[PDB]
Amino acid sequence: DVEFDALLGSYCNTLSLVRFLELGLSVACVCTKFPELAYMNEGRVQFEV
């Protein structure tokens, strides 16, 4: 009596590297980065009319 078992192929994924600028939503932001934020308490932005 002769038998065998078999692994007939094994499959994986490709995780999609999503970037934020590639989206269409990237208009609704003003993205300028900090090298520090947690060194900062309440900051403010002024507006004149």
Partner 1 sequence: HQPLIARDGPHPIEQPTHNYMTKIIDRRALNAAFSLATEAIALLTGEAL
**Contacts with partner 1, residue ranges (CB under 8 A):** 8, 12-13, 15-16
Of residues 16 and 41, the one with the C-beta less far from partner 1: 16
Of residues 20 and 47, the one with the C-beta less far from partner 1: 20
Task: Give the shortest CB-47-to-partner 1 separation in angstroms.
Answer: 27
Of residues 15 and 45, the one with the C-beta less far from partner 1: 15
In whole angstroms, what is the distance from residue 33 CA to residue 18 CA? 19
In whole angstroms, what is the distance from residue 30 CA to residue 15 CA? 28
Residue 21's nearest CA partner among 33, 12, 29 is: 29
